[PDB]
Amino acid sequence: GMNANQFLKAVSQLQGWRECAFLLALAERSFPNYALFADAVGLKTGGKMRQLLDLAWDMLQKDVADAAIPQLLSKLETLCPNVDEYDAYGVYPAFDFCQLLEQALLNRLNPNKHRATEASQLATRTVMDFVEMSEGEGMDENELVRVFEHHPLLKDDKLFQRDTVMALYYYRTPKEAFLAELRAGAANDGVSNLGISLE
Amino acid sequence: GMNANQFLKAVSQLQGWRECAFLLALAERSFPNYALFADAVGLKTGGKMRQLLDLAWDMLQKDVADAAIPQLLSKLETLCPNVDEYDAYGVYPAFDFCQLLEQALLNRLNPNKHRATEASQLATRTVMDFVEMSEGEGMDENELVRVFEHHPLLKDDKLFQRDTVMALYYYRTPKEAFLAELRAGAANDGVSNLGISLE
Ligand code: NA
Ligand code: NA
C-alpha cells in the first residue's frame, strides 16, 4: 500500500512490463493532442502515429528484435513536429506526446534506465502548461496555482496517473496473490485509518 | 476508466467477489481500532476478532455453507460493544469496525443487496468523527471543514479507498485482459488529458 504522499514513490519503483504499461498509458492519454494537431495543420500523420502507438502496445506481450527498435524511433522522429516551425499552441502537446511514446520505445531497448518519474512530470506539465495558456493570462502566480488546485483537467490527470500506477502496483496472478496484496495494503502494517496501532 | 469525480460511481458498481474484497479492505483498515479498544477496556476479544476477520478473508476463495453464516454474525454480535456502555471515545471506532465486518458477512448470505456505497461513507465518517473529536473543539464549522480538507488521515483514507476500488475495477485475468482495461482507461473514449478529441 501507498499513502496519499506516495504516488511518486510507487512510480519510482515501476519496472519491467509495469513500467512500459505506465509509459504507454501516459502516451495513450495524450494521443488525441497529436491527432488534433496533425489534422489542424494538414499533416497526414495521425493515422500513421495511431499505428505506431498500437504497435508499441502490442509489443507489451510480444518478443521484438532489439535490432528493429532503432528504426521505430527513426519513424517516430519523422512524425514528430518541431515546435519552432509551427505558430499554433497545439504543436506543444503534440510534441509532448511524441516524447512520451519515445520513452516507451527507448525502454524496450534500454529497460534498466528509470523513466516513469520524469515521464509523469512531463505528462502533468502538459496539462499545467495548457491551463496556464488558456486561463492564466494576466493572473498572479498565486492565483494561477489556485486555478491549478481545483481545475478539473488537473484533478482528473492526477487521479488518472495514480489509478494507473496503483492498478499496476497491486496487480498479481493468480487472483489469490492479488487479494493478498490488496489485503496487505489495507492492513497498513497494523496502523488503522485513525493513525493508531497496537504497537 | 473513472474520472476524479467517479469514485462513488466505481464503488456503486462493485459486485461479487470484488464487492466482498472492498468491504473486507475497509474492515481490515479499521481493525486496529477494535484491537486497541478491546485491549484498553480489558476485553480479551482482540484475538478472537482477528480470527473472525481472518476467516472472512479466507472465505473469499472458499465455499461456505449458507447454513453456517448466521452463527458467524451471532459470534460477531457477542464481540461487538454497545457504545452507551463505555465512556471512552475508542468504543465508537470499535463499533464502526464491527459494522464494516458485519456488512462483509451479511454479503455472503445476501450478495445481491448493494453495500459498498454506505460502507465507504461509514469508513470516511469514522475518520471525520475522530478528527472532529480530537481537533475540532471550539472550531466553527467552516474552520473544521478546512481542517478536513488538508488532514493527512482524511487525505490518506480517501486515497486508500480509491486505490482499492480502482485496483479491483481494472483487475482481470489473464494479464492481457488487464492490460486491455488499463489501455481503455487511458484512451478515455478518445478524449485527451486536455479535454479535447477528434470528434
Ligand atoms: Na526502465
Ligand atoms: Na452485495
Side-chain angles (χ1 to χ4, degrees), chain A residues 4 17 25 29-30 32-33 35 50 54 57 61 155-156 159 162-163 166 171-172 175-176 178 183 185-186 190 192-193 196 198, chain B residues 4 17 25 29-30 32-33 35 50 54 57 61 155-156 159 162-163 166 171-172 175-176 178 183 185-186 190 192-193 196 198:
Chain A
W17 68 266
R29 175 62 62 99
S30 280
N33 304 325
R50 180 68 266 176
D54 285 356
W57 279 111
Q61 292 193 98
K155 293 182 304 207
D156 285 351
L159 285 177
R162 187 185 180 103
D163 292 348
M166 300 306 170
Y171 176 89
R172 300 292 186 282
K175 167 149 77 166
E176 176 174 26
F178 171 68
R183 176 184 174 159
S192 79
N193 53 358
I196 66 75
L198 219 158
Chain B
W17 68 266
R29 175 62 62 99
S30 280
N33 304 325
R50 180 68 266 176
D54 285 356
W57 279 111
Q61 292 193 98
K155 293 182 304 207
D156 285 351
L159 285 177
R162 187 185 180 103
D163 292 348
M166 300 306 170
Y171 176 89
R172 300 292 186 282
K175 167 149 77 166
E176 176 174 26
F178 171 68
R183 176 184 174 159
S192 79
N193 53 358
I196 66 75
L198 219 158

Short mmCIF file of all heavy atoms in Angstrom, two decimals, chain A residues 4 17 25 29-30 32-33 35 50 54 57 61 155-156 159 162-163 166 171-172 175-176 178 183 185-186 190 192-193 196 198, chain B residues 4 17 25 29-30 32-33 35 50 54 57 61 155-156 159 162-163 166 171-172 175-176 178 183 185-186 190 192-193 196 198:
data_model
loop_
_atom_site.label_atom_id
_atom_site.label_comp_id
_atom_site.label_asym_id
_atom_site.label_seq_id
_atom_site.Cartn_x
_atom_site.Cartn_y
_atom_site.Cartn_z
N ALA A 4 -1.28 8.81 0.70
CA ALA A 4 -1.62 9.97 -0.16
C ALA A 4 -0.38 10.81 -0.63
O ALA A 4 -0.48 11.59 -1.58
CB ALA A 4 -2.67 10.88 0.53
N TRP A 17 7.48 -4.90 -17.38
CA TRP A 17 6.30 -4.62 -18.15
C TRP A 17 5.41 -3.51 -17.52
O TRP A 17 4.73 -2.79 -18.24
CB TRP A 17 5.50 -5.91 -18.42
CG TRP A 17 4.86 -6.55 -17.25
CD1 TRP A 17 5.37 -7.57 -16.49
CD2 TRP A 17 3.57 -6.25 -16.71
NE1 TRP A 17 4.48 -7.90 -15.51
CE2 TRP A 17 3.36 -7.11 -15.63
CE3 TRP A 17 2.55 -5.34 -17.06
CZ2 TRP A 17 2.19 -7.08 -14.85
CZ3 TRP A 17 1.39 -5.33 -16.32
CH2 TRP A 17 1.23 -6.18 -15.21
N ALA A 25 0.38 4.16 -21.13
CA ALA A 25 -0.83 4.80 -20.63
C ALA A 25 -0.75 6.33 -20.72
O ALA A 25 -1.66 7.00 -21.21
CB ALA A 25 -1.13 4.35 -19.20
N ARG A 29 -3.18 8.55 -23.32
CA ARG A 29 -3.99 9.66 -22.82
C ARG A 29 -3.70 10.97 -23.52
O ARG A 29 -4.55 11.85 -23.61
CB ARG A 29 -3.80 9.80 -21.30
CG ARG A 29 -4.51 11.01 -20.65
CD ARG A 29 -6.07 10.94 -20.80
NE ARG A 29 -6.72 9.78 -20.16
CZ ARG A 29 -7.34 9.77 -18.97
NH1 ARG A 29 -7.34 10.84 -18.16
NH2 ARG A 29 -7.95 8.66 -18.55
N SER A 30 -2.50 11.09 -24.05
CA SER A 30 -2.10 12.27 -24.81
C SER A 30 -2.32 12.20 -26.30
O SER A 30 -2.26 13.22 -26.98
CB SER A 30 -0.61 12.54 -24.54
OG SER A 30 -0.53 13.20 -23.30
N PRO A 32 -4.73 11.99 -28.54
CA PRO A 32 -5.59 12.88 -29.33
C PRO A 32 -5.02 14.29 -29.52
O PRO A 32 -5.43 14.99 -30.44
CB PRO A 32 -6.90 12.91 -28.57
CG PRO A 32 -6.89 11.65 -27.75
CD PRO A 32 -5.43 11.48 -27.35
N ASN A 33 -4.11 14.72 -28.65
CA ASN A 33 -3.44 16.01 -28.88
C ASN A 33 -2.58 15.97 -30.15
O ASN A 33 -2.49 16.97 -30.90
CB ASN A 33 -2.59 16.42 -27.68
CG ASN A 33 -3.36 16.47 -26.37
OD1 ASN A 33 -4.54 16.84 -26.33
ND2 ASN A 33 -2.68 16.10 -25.28
N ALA A 35 -3.15 13.82 -32.73
CA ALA A 35 -4.10 13.67 -33.84
C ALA A 35 -4.73 15.01 -34.23
O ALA A 35 -4.84 15.35 -35.43
CB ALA A 35 -5.18 12.66 -33.47
N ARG A 50 -1.11 6.58 -34.96
CA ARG A 50 -2.03 5.64 -34.28
C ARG A 50 -1.52 4.20 -34.42
O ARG A 50 -1.51 3.45 -33.45
CB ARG A 50 -3.45 5.80 -34.87
CG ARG A 50 -4.53 4.90 -34.27
CD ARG A 50 -4.85 5.26 -32.82
NE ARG A 50 -4.08 4.44 -31.90
CZ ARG A 50 -4.08 4.58 -30.59
NH1 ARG A 50 -4.81 5.52 -30.00
NH2 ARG A 50 -3.34 3.75 -29.84
N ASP A 54 -0.26 1.80 -31.53
CA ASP A 54 -0.85 0.45 -31.45
C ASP A 54 0.22 -0.61 -31.37
O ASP A 54 0.12 -1.54 -30.57
CB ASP A 54 -1.76 0.14 -32.65
CG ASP A 54 -3.09 0.85 -32.57
OD1 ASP A 54 -3.39 1.53 -31.57
OD2 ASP A 54 -3.83 0.75 -33.55
N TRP A 57 1.88 -0.75 -27.92
CA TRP A 57 1.01 -1.55 -27.03
C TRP A 57 1.14 -3.07 -27.33
O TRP A 57 1.28 -3.87 -26.41
CB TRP A 57 -0.46 -1.16 -27.17
CG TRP A 57 -0.90 0.06 -26.40
CD1 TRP A 57 -1.27 1.23 -26.92
CD2 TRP A 57 -1.00 0.20 -24.99
NE1 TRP A 57 -1.64 2.11 -25.94
CE2 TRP A 57 -1.49 1.50 -24.74
CE3 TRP A 57 -0.75 -0.66 -23.92
CZ2 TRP A 57 -1.72 1.98 -23.46
CZ3 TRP A 57 -0.98 -0.20 -22.64
CH2 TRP A 57 -1.46 1.14 -22.42
N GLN A 61 3.20 -7.65 -25.06
CA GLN A 61 3.18 -9.09 -24.91
C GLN A 61 3.74 -9.88 -26.10
O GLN A 61 3.34 -11.00 -26.33
CB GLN A 61 1.77 -9.52 -24.53
CG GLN A 61 1.41 -9.02 -23.11
CD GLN A 61 0.16 -9.70 -22.60
OE1 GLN A 61 0.22 -10.69 -21.84
NE2 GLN A 61 -0.98 -9.23 -23.09
N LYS A 155 -7.13 17.90 -11.72
CA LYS A 155 -7.64 16.88 -10.76
C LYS A 155 -7.78 15.52 -11.44
O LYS A 155 -7.38 14.48 -10.90
CB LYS A 155 -8.96 17.31 -10.11
CG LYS A 155 -8.80 18.52 -9.19
CD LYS A 155 -10.10 18.95 -8.47
CE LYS A 155 -11.28 19.25 -9.42
NZ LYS A 155 -12.32 20.26 -8.89
N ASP A 156 -8.33 15.51 -12.65
CA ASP A 156 -8.51 14.26 -13.35
C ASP A 156 -7.19 13.62 -13.74
O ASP A 156 -7.03 12.40 -13.63
CB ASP A 156 -9.33 14.43 -14.61
CG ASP A 156 -10.80 14.63 -14.35
OD1 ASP A 156 -11.27 14.47 -13.20
OD2 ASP A 156 -11.47 15.01 -15.32
N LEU A 159 -5.56 11.87 -10.81
CA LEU A 159 -6.19 10.60 -10.44
C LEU A 159 -6.06 9.54 -11.53
O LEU A 159 -5.97 8.37 -11.23
CB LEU A 159 -7.64 10.82 -9.99
CG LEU A 159 -7.60 11.43 -8.57
CD1 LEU A 159 -8.95 11.74 -8.09
CD2 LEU A 159 -6.91 10.50 -7.60
N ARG A 162 -2.46 8.23 -10.87
CA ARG A 162 -2.47 7.43 -9.68
C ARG A 162 -3.24 6.11 -9.86
O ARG A 162 -2.73 5.05 -9.50
CB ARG A 162 -2.98 8.22 -8.47
CG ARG A 162 -2.81 7.41 -7.20
CD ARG A 162 -3.41 8.06 -5.94
NE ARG A 162 -3.18 7.19 -4.80
CZ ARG A 162 -2.25 7.36 -3.86
NH1 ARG A 162 -1.42 8.38 -3.88
NH2 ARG A 162 -2.12 6.43 -2.92
N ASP A 163 -4.44 6.15 -10.44
CA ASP A 163 -5.19 4.90 -10.69
C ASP A 163 -4.38 3.92 -11.50
O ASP A 163 -4.36 2.72 -11.21
CB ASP A 163 -6.50 5.19 -11.45
CG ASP A 163 -7.54 5.95 -10.64
OD1 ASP A 163 -7.40 6.09 -9.41
OD2 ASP A 163 -8.54 6.42 -11.24
N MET A 166 -1.30 2.58 -9.38
CA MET A 166 -1.77 1.68 -8.31
C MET A 166 -2.40 0.39 -8.79
O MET A 166 -2.23 -0.66 -8.17
CB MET A 166 -2.66 2.43 -7.33
CG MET A 166 -1.95 3.58 -6.65
SD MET A 166 -0.28 3.12 -5.77
CE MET A 166 0.25 4.92 -5.44
N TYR A 171 -1.52 -5.35 -8.96
CA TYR A 171 -1.80 -6.48 -9.85
C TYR A 171 -0.82 -7.63 -9.60
O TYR A 171 0.37 -7.41 -9.42
CB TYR A 171 -1.77 -6.04 -11.32
CG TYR A 171 -1.97 -7.20 -12.27
CD1 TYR A 171 -3.23 -7.59 -12.69
CD2 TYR A 171 -0.88 -7.94 -12.71
CE1 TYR A 171 -3.40 -8.69 -13.54
CE2 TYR A 171 -1.04 -9.02 -13.54
CZ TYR A 171 -2.30 -9.38 -13.96
OH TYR A 171 -2.41 -10.46 -14.80
N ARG A 172 -1.36 -8.84 -9.57
CA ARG A 172 -0.59 -10.08 -9.45
C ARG A 172 -1.44 -11.17 -10.07
O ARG A 172 -2.66 -11.02 -10.24
CB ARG A 172 -0.31 -10.54 -8.01
CG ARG A 172 0.47 -9.62 -7.07
CD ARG A 172 1.99 -9.46 -7.52
NE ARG A 172 2.71 -8.68 -6.50
CZ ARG A 172 2.63 -7.35 -6.37
NH1 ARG A 172 1.91 -6.62 -7.19
NH2 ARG A 172 3.29 -6.75 -5.40
N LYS A 175 -5.41 -14.77 -8.84
CA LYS A 175 -6.30 -13.94 -8.05
C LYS A 175 -5.94 -13.91 -6.57
O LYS A 175 -6.05 -12.88 -5.90
CB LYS A 175 -7.74 -14.40 -8.22
CG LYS A 175 -8.68 -13.80 -7.20
CD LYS A 175 -10.10 -13.57 -7.64
CE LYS A 175 -10.89 -14.77 -7.67
NZ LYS A 175 -12.31 -14.39 -7.77
N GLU A 176 -5.56 -15.06 -6.04
CA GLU A 176 -5.20 -15.15 -4.64
C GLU A 176 -4.07 -14.19 -4.27
O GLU A 176 -4.08 -13.58 -3.21
CB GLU A 176 -4.77 -16.59 -4.30
CG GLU A 176 -4.29 -16.77 -2.86
CD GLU A 176 -4.00 -18.24 -2.50
OE1 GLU A 176 -3.70 -19.04 -3.41
OE2 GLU A 176 -4.08 -18.59 -1.30
N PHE A 178 -3.20 -11.46 -5.90
CA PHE A 178 -3.77 -10.11 -5.95
C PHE A 178 -4.50 -9.78 -4.66
O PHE A 178 -4.31 -8.70 -4.09
CB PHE A 178 -4.70 -10.00 -7.17
CG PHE A 178 -5.52 -8.74 -7.21
CD1 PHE A 178 -4.92 -7.51 -7.42
CD2 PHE A 178 -6.90 -8.80 -7.06
CE1 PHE A 178 -5.69 -6.35 -7.45
CE2 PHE A 178 -7.67 -7.63 -7.10
CZ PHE A 178 -7.08 -6.41 -7.31
N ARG A 183 -5.04 -6.95 0.51
CA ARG A 183 -5.24 -7.09 1.97
C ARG A 183 -4.10 -6.43 2.73
O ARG A 183 -4.32 -5.73 3.73
CB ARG A 183 -5.32 -8.57 2.35
CG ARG A 183 -5.43 -8.84 3.81
CD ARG A 183 -5.41 -10.31 4.11
NE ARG A 183 -5.37 -10.55 5.54
CZ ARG A 183 -5.73 -11.70 6.12
NH1 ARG A 183 -6.12 -12.72 5.39
NH2 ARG A 183 -5.65 -11.85 7.43
N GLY A 185 -2.17 -4.07 1.85
CA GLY A 185 -2.29 -2.63 1.74
C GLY A 185 -3.30 -2.07 2.73
O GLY A 185 -3.03 -1.04 3.39
N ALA A 186 -4.45 -2.73 2.85
CA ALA A 186 -5.45 -2.28 3.83
C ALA A 186 -4.92 -2.42 5.25
O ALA A 186 -5.26 -1.60 6.11
CB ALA A 186 -6.77 -3.04 3.67
N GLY A 190 -0.51 -2.75 10.34
CA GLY A 190 -1.17 -2.69 11.63
C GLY A 190 -1.55 -1.28 12.10
O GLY A 190 -1.94 -1.11 13.26
N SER A 192 -4.15 1.71 11.74
CA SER A 192 -5.54 1.92 11.30
C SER A 192 -5.70 3.24 10.55
O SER A 192 -4.78 4.05 10.51
CB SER A 192 -6.48 1.93 12.49
OG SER A 192 -6.49 3.18 13.19
N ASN A 193 -6.91 3.45 10.02
CA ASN A 193 -7.32 4.72 9.46
C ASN A 193 -7.26 5.90 10.39
O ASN A 193 -7.36 7.01 9.93
CB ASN A 193 -8.77 4.62 8.91
CG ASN A 193 -9.76 4.11 9.93
OD1 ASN A 193 -9.39 3.77 11.08
ND2 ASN A 193 -11.05 4.09 9.53
N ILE A 196 -3.51 4.92 14.51
CA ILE A 196 -3.11 4.19 15.70
C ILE A 196 -2.81 2.69 15.40
O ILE A 196 -3.16 2.17 14.33
CB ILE A 196 -4.10 4.41 16.81
CG1 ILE A 196 -5.46 3.79 16.48
CG2 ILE A 196 -4.25 5.95 17.13
CD1 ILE A 196 -5.47 2.29 16.60
N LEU A 198 -1.59 -1.29 17.62
CA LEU A 198 -1.34 -1.95 18.91
C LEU A 198 0.15 -2.31 18.87
O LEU A 198 0.51 -3.45 18.59
CB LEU A 198 -2.26 -3.16 19.12
CG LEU A 198 -2.80 -3.35 20.55
CD1 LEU A 198 -4.06 -4.19 20.55
CD2 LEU A 198 -1.74 -3.94 21.49
N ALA B 4 -11.86 11.96 -11.78
CA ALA B 4 -11.67 12.42 -10.37
C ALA B 4 -13.00 12.59 -9.57
O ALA B 4 -12.98 12.66 -8.34
CB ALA B 4 -10.83 13.72 -10.33
N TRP B 17 -17.17 -11.04 -5.89
CA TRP B 17 -16.01 -11.08 -5.04
C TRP B 17 -15.36 -9.68 -4.84
O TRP B 17 -14.77 -9.42 -3.80
CB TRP B 17 -14.99 -12.11 -5.54
CG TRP B 17 -14.32 -11.82 -6.82
CD1 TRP B 17 -14.70 -12.25 -8.07
CD2 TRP B 17 -13.13 -11.04 -7.01
NE1 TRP B 17 -13.81 -11.78 -9.01
CE2 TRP B 17 -12.84 -11.04 -8.38
CE3 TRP B 17 -12.26 -10.36 -6.13
CZ2 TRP B 17 -11.74 -10.36 -8.92
CZ3 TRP B 17 -11.17 -9.72 -6.66
CH2 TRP B 17 -10.92 -9.70 -8.04
N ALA B 25 -11.49 -4.94 2.90
CA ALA B 25 -10.43 -3.94 2.94
C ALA B 25 -10.77 -2.80 3.92
O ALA B 25 -9.96 -2.41 4.76
CB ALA B 25 -10.15 -3.39 1.54
N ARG B 29 -8.60 -2.19 7.46
CA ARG B 29 -8.02 -0.88 7.76
C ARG B 29 -8.49 -0.31 9.09
O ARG B 29 -7.80 0.46 9.73
CB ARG B 29 -8.32 0.10 6.61
CG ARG B 29 -7.86 1.56 6.85
CD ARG B 29 -6.31 1.67 7.02
NE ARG B 29 -5.50 1.25 5.85
CZ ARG B 29 -4.96 2.06 4.93
NH1 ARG B 29 -5.18 3.37 4.91
NH2 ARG B 29 -4.20 1.54 3.96
N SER B 30 -9.66 -0.74 9.52
CA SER B 30 -10.21 -0.33 10.80
C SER B 30 -9.90 -1.24 11.97
O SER B 30 -10.09 -0.84 13.12
CB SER B 30 -11.74 -0.20 10.67
OG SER B 30 -12.00 1.03 10.05
N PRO B 32 -7.36 -2.32 13.78
CA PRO B 32 -6.63 -1.95 14.99
C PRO B 32 -7.41 -1.04 15.95
O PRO B 32 -7.08 -0.98 17.12
CB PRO B 32 -5.38 -1.25 14.47
CG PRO B 32 -5.23 -1.76 13.06
CD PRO B 32 -6.65 -1.90 12.56
N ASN B 33 -8.43 -0.34 15.46
CA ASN B 33 -9.29 0.42 16.37
C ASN B 33 -10.06 -0.51 17.32
O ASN B 33 -10.27 -0.18 18.50
CB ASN B 33 -10.27 1.31 15.60
CG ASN B 33 -9.59 2.26 14.63
OD1 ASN B 33 -8.49 2.78 14.87
ND2 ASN B 33 -10.26 2.51 13.49
N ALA B 35 -8.99 -3.64 18.14
CA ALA B 35 -7.97 -4.25 18.99
C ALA B 35 -7.56 -3.32 20.13
O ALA B 35 -7.43 -3.75 21.31
CB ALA B 35 -6.76 -4.65 18.16
N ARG B 50 -9.66 -11.00 15.52
CA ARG B 50 -8.64 -11.19 14.46
C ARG B 50 -8.89 -12.48 13.69
O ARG B 50 -8.83 -12.50 12.47
CB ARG B 50 -7.23 -11.17 15.11
CG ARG B 50 -6.05 -11.34 14.16
CD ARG B 50 -5.88 -10.14 13.23
NE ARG B 50 -6.55 -10.36 11.95
CZ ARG B 50 -6.64 -9.48 10.98
NH1 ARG B 50 -6.12 -8.27 11.11
NH2 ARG B 50 -7.28 -9.81 9.85
N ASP B 54 -9.88 -12.86 9.88
CA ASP B 54 -9.08 -13.78 9.04
C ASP B 54 -9.96 -14.75 8.29
O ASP B 54 -9.75 -14.99 7.10
CB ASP B 54 -8.07 -14.59 9.87
CG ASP B 54 -6.88 -13.76 10.31
OD1 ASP B 54 -6.76 -12.57 9.92
OD2 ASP B 54 -6.08 -14.29 11.08
N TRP B 57 -11.77 -13.09 5.35
CA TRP B 57 -10.83 -13.05 4.20
C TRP B 57 -10.68 -14.44 3.53
O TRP B 57 -10.74 -14.54 2.31
CB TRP B 57 -9.43 -12.57 4.63
CG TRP B 57 -9.25 -11.08 4.76
CD1 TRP B 57 -9.06 -10.41 5.90
CD2 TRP B 57 -9.25 -10.12 3.72
NE1 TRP B 57 -8.89 -9.07 5.65
CE2 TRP B 57 -9.01 -8.86 4.32
CE3 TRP B 57 -9.41 -10.20 2.33
CZ2 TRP B 57 -8.94 -7.68 3.59
CZ3 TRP B 57 -9.34 -9.04 1.60
CH2 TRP B 57 -9.11 -7.78 2.24
N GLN B 61 -12.07 -17.04 -1.12
CA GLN B 61 -11.81 -18.08 -2.09
C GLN B 61 -12.17 -19.50 -1.64
O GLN B 61 -11.57 -20.46 -2.10
CB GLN B 61 -10.38 -17.96 -2.57
CG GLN B 61 -10.18 -16.66 -3.40
CD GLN B 61 -8.87 -16.68 -4.14
OE1 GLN B 61 -8.80 -17.02 -5.34
NE2 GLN B 61 -7.79 -16.41 -3.41
N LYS B 155 -6.94 12.72 3.93
CA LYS B 155 -6.32 12.57 2.58
C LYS B 155 -5.91 11.12 2.32
O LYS B 155 -6.16 10.55 1.25
CB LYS B 155 -5.12 13.52 2.38
CG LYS B 155 -5.54 14.99 2.36
CD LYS B 155 -4.37 15.98 2.10
CE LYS B 155 -3.21 15.84 3.11
NZ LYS B 155 -2.39 17.13 3.34
N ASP B 156 -5.31 10.49 3.31
CA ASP B 156 -4.88 9.12 3.14
C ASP B 156 -6.05 8.16 3.00
O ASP B 156 -6.00 7.24 2.19
CB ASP B 156 -4.03 8.64 4.30
CG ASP B 156 -2.63 9.21 4.29
OD1 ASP B 156 -2.20 9.84 3.30
OD2 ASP B 156 -1.97 9.03 5.34
N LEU B 159 -7.52 8.25 -0.47
CA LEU B 159 -6.70 7.58 -1.49
C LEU B 159 -6.60 6.08 -1.26
O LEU B 159 -6.51 5.32 -2.20
CB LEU B 159 -5.35 8.27 -1.64
CG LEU B 159 -5.56 9.58 -2.42
CD1 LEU B 159 -4.31 10.33 -2.55
CD2 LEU B 159 -6.14 9.30 -3.79
N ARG B 162 -9.96 4.83 -2.76
CA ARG B 162 -9.88 4.91 -4.19
C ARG B 162 -8.89 3.89 -4.79
O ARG B 162 -9.23 3.19 -5.74
CB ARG B 162 -9.57 6.33 -4.67
CG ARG B 162 -9.68 6.43 -6.18
CD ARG B 162 -9.27 7.79 -6.77
NE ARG B 162 -9.41 7.73 -8.21
CZ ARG B 162 -10.41 8.27 -8.92
NH1 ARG B 162 -11.39 8.93 -8.35
NH2 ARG B 162 -10.43 8.08 -10.23
N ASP B 163 -7.68 3.78 -4.24
CA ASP B 163 -6.72 2.78 -4.73
C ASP B 163 -7.31 1.39 -4.71
O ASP B 163 -7.14 0.61 -5.65
CB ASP B 163 -5.44 2.77 -3.88
CG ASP B 163 -4.59 4.02 -4.02
OD1 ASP B 163 -4.82 4.85 -4.93
OD2 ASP B 163 -3.64 4.20 -3.20
N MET B 166 -10.23 1.07 -7.38
CA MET B 166 -9.68 1.08 -8.75
C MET B 166 -8.81 -0.11 -9.09
O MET B 166 -8.84 -0.60 -10.22
CB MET B 166 -8.98 2.40 -9.04
CG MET B 166 -9.92 3.59 -8.94
SD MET B 166 -11.53 3.47 -10.01
CE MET B 166 -12.37 5.00 -9.24
N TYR B 171 -8.71 -4.88 -12.41
CA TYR B 171 -8.19 -6.25 -12.35
C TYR B 171 -8.97 -7.17 -13.29
O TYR B 171 -10.20 -7.09 -13.37
CB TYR B 171 -8.21 -6.78 -10.92
CG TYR B 171 -7.77 -8.22 -10.83
CD1 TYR B 171 -6.43 -8.56 -10.65
CD2 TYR B 171 -8.70 -9.25 -10.98
CE1 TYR B 171 -6.03 -9.91 -10.62
CE2 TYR B 171 -8.31 -10.57 -10.95
CZ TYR B 171 -6.99 -10.89 -10.75
OH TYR B 171 -6.64 -12.22 -10.71
N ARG B 172 -8.24 -8.01 -14.01
CA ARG B 172 -8.80 -9.05 -14.88
C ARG B 172 -7.74 -10.13 -14.98
O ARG B 172 -6.56 -9.91 -14.69
CB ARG B 172 -9.07 -8.60 -16.33
CG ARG B 172 -10.05 -7.45 -16.57
CD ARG B 172 -11.55 -7.84 -16.21
NE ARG B 172 -12.44 -6.74 -16.60
CZ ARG B 172 -12.60 -5.61 -15.91
NH1 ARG B 172 -11.96 -5.41 -14.78
NH2 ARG B 172 -13.40 -4.68 -16.37
N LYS B 175 -3.30 -11.57 -17.88
CA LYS B 175 -2.61 -10.29 -17.98
C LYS B 175 -3.05 -9.45 -19.17
O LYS B 175 -3.16 -8.23 -19.08
CB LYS B 175 -1.10 -10.51 -18.03
CG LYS B 175 -0.34 -9.27 -18.45
CD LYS B 175 1.05 -9.12 -17.87
CE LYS B 175 2.03 -9.95 -18.52
NZ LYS B 175 3.36 -9.48 -18.13
N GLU B 176 -3.27 -10.11 -20.29
CA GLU B 176 -3.68 -9.41 -21.50
C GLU B 176 -4.98 -8.62 -21.29
O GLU B 176 -5.12 -7.51 -21.77
CB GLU B 176 -3.87 -10.41 -22.65
CG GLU B 176 -4.41 -9.78 -23.93
CD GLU B 176 -4.46 -10.77 -25.11
OE1 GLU B 176 -4.57 -11.99 -24.88
OE2 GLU B 176 -4.39 -10.32 -26.28
N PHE B 178 -6.20 -7.59 -18.41
CA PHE B 178 -5.86 -6.46 -17.53
C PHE B 178 -5.27 -5.31 -18.33
O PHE B 178 -5.67 -4.16 -18.15
CB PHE B 178 -4.89 -6.94 -16.44
CG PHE B 178 -4.30 -5.84 -15.61
CD1 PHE B 178 -5.08 -5.09 -14.74
CD2 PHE B 178 -2.94 -5.56 -15.69
CE1 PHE B 178 -4.51 -4.07 -13.98
CE2 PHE B 178 -2.37 -4.54 -14.92
CZ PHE B 178 -3.15 -3.80 -14.06
N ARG B 183 -5.50 0.08 -20.77
CA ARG B 183 -5.36 0.86 -22.01
C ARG B 183 -6.64 1.65 -22.30
O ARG B 183 -6.59 2.83 -22.67
CB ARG B 183 -5.05 -0.05 -23.19
CG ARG B 183 -4.98 0.62 -24.52
CD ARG B 183 -4.77 -0.36 -25.63
NE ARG B 183 -4.85 0.29 -26.93
CZ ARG B 183 -4.34 -0.22 -28.05
NH1 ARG B 183 -3.74 -1.39 -28.05
NH2 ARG B 183 -4.46 0.43 -29.19
N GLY B 185 -8.89 2.66 -20.29
CA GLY B 185 -9.00 3.75 -19.34
C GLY B 185 -8.16 4.94 -19.75
O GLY B 185 -8.64 6.10 -19.68
N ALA B 186 -6.92 4.69 -20.17
CA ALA B 186 -6.06 5.80 -20.63
C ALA B 186 -6.64 6.43 -21.89
O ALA B 186 -6.50 7.65 -22.08
CB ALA B 186 -4.64 5.33 -20.89
N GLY B 190 -11.22 8.46 -26.42
CA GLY B 190 -10.65 9.38 -27.37
C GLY B 190 -10.54 10.84 -26.90
O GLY B 190 -10.24 11.72 -27.71
N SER B 192 -8.46 13.41 -24.69
CA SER B 192 -7.10 13.55 -24.13
C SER B 192 -7.12 14.17 -22.74
O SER B 192 -8.16 14.62 -22.28
CB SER B 192 -6.24 14.43 -25.03
OG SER B 192 -6.49 15.82 -24.85
N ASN B 193 -5.94 14.22 -22.12
CA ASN B 193 -5.72 14.96 -20.89
C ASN B 193 -6.02 16.43 -20.94
O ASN B 193 -6.09 17.05 -19.90
CB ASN B 193 -4.25 14.80 -20.43
CG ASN B 193 -3.24 15.16 -21.50
OD1 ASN B 193 -3.61 15.52 -22.64
ND2 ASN B 193 -1.95 15.13 -21.12
N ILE B 196 -9.78 17.48 -25.04
CA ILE B 196 -10.12 17.54 -26.45
C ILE B 196 -10.15 16.13 -27.12
O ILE B 196 -9.65 15.15 -26.55
CB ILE B 196 -9.24 18.54 -27.16
CG1 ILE B 196 -7.78 18.09 -27.18
CG2 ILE B 196 -9.38 19.96 -26.49
CD1 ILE B 196 -7.53 16.97 -28.17
N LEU B 198 -10.80 14.11 -31.34
CA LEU B 198 -11.01 14.32 -32.78
C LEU B 198 -12.42 13.76 -33.04
O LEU B 198 -12.56 12.64 -33.51
CB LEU B 198 -9.92 13.65 -33.61
CG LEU B 198 -9.43 14.44 -34.84
CD1 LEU B 198 -8.05 13.98 -35.27
CD2 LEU B 198 -10.43 14.35 -36.01
#
